[PDB]
Design a protein around this ligand. Structure first.
Ligand SMILES: Nc1ncnc2c1ncn2[C@@H]1O[C@H](CSCC[C@H](N)C(=O)O)[C@@H](O)[C@H]1O
Ligand SMILES: Nc1ncnc2c1ncn2[C@@H]1O[C@H](CSCC[C@H](N)C(=O)O)[C@@H](O)[C@H]1O
Lengths: 257, 268
């Protein structure tokens, strides 16, 4: 796991959220797809409550753009301090922060409530109350005396679990671990790569467990989830850019029984 | 009785018009604040988008009358016309457009407007595609004087007659009085084909505005005077709506009391 110690936030953002993967203009791309799954799910009105926790946020905030308008108390997390630092730079409008505005705009476009992207960001920054350390390999991922209001009404996690797990079983356990933070009847929005085995973050090469959609489905089940929705996006050739070997992306809406 | 003097005053005044100050005064916040849907900015765009959304205003050629240094007035139009002529009396304004067309950084930044237009047209178009289409479709930027019987001049490049006209805050801003306004309206109407459409936006009951040093005179007009002039020019008025300028948007840059938007279709 020491690999994550060389993990470079800026190179990750560059490899994953700048063009071409970051070009949101084309509806057929992966960016628009991720935002679409997130927006559609919240527009249902069925994922609701007061507190939400984002698992393995890394240096990215897009995974909460549609979420922030349904949850007044949001908790962001990551294993790496550099990532938490990088998040602070955006939440605080500090210098050299990452530019997420194309995403705020597209979330506003997709949601179709006529909202200006600045209001969207304003609300997100306002509702993220804390950025906490987290280790999903631990039975209590957040630790013992966490400031985060537990249990959460809902969880989000994107491209974390499969990316921090050596194999299927470790993936399963981590899902078990985060699930304990989720209140019964609560909701989980799980996003991640399909059949991926490595990706690069500057000097770091990270190992990934290659999971399939049926494997994701079954794990959610064995964790005590009812799968409300599971969709797949197949990675087009032009977005296979040498920064990894992800074949596709899955999105899961699941509900703790 | 004799139009030259007033027209002469007008041209004289506009020699001091400062495009950057005008852009700031009218299209930068608070008026450029597109987040507040009760604001004048969102209303202008909404009037435009909804009209084009009917599918009822289309064709090949469009001419924008008195563009000045602004492009927001063409954001919803540009998907409906493949040939767009832009126009202004002042070279400096035309130079400003030229700067946006070349996509220079020195240019006024209209992307908030492009975004918002994309937002309310509701087709999920990204703003960079919106802008790229506008840039591609503007075929020319021409000098114009609406007080001339032939506003574009003799033997213009413009494809005439156009299928549609846009004109925003021009006529009233350059007409000393109502009869001048009416005449200007008559003049631009010759550039439009019968059965074609005019989208007219303008200030209501405005007598002055600032554009840097220049303090320019506007004929104050009412909604009914606008309607009558349209009828007098040979249009059917399809739509005429009004926006009242909220106090918080009255900022000492002018004395506009409200804004009007007219959708009118030339008879023939
Ligand atoms: N043992 C662990 N427990 C929880 N998160 C971990 C972890 N080891 C690494 N991580 C974090 O897992 C993330 C994988 S990539 C970041 C994903 C981000 N949410 C996005 O959607 O793009 C990195 O931020 C990494 O630092
Ligand atoms: N005699 C004339 N004929 C046509 N346009 C004129 C004119 N005299 C001045 N103008 C232009 O009328 C404009 C008024 S300002 C409105 C500009 C822009 N359409 C907007 O929507 O903000 C200025 O650009 C001015 O240069």
């Amino acid at each position: 796991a020491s690999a994550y110690q060389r993990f470079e936030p800026r190179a990750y953002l560059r490899n994953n959220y700048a063009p071409p993967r970051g070009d949101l203009c084309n509806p057929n791309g992966v960016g628009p797809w991720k935002l679409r799954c997130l927006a559609q799910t919240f527009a249902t009105g069925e994922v609701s409550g007061r507190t939400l926790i984002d698992i393995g946020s890394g240096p990215t905030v897009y995974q909460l753009l549609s979420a922030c308008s349904h949850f007044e108390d949001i908790t962001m997390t990551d294993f790496l301090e550099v990532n938490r630092q990088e998040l602070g730079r955006w939440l605080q409008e500090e210098p050299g922060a990452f530019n997420w505005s194309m995403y705020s705009q597209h979330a506003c476009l997709i949601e179709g409530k006529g909202e200006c992207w600045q209001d969207k960001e304003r609300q997100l920054r306002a509702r993220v109350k804390r950025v906490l350390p987290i280790d999903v390999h631990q039975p209590q991922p957040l630790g013992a005396g966490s400031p985060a209001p537990l249990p959460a009404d809902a969880l989000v996690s994107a491209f974390c679990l499969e990316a921090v797990s050596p194999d299927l079983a470790s993936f399963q356990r981590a899902l078990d671990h985060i699930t304990t933070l989720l209140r019964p009847g609560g909701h989980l929005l799980l996003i991640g790569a399909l059949e991926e085995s490595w990706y690069l973050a500057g000097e770091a090469r990270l190992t990934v467990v290659p999971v399939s959609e049926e494997e994701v489905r079954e794990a959610l089940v064995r964790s005590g989830y009812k799968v409300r929705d599971l969709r797949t996006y197949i990675m087009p050739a032009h977005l296979q850019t040498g920064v990894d070997d992800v074949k596709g992306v899955f999105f899961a809406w699941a509900q703790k029984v």
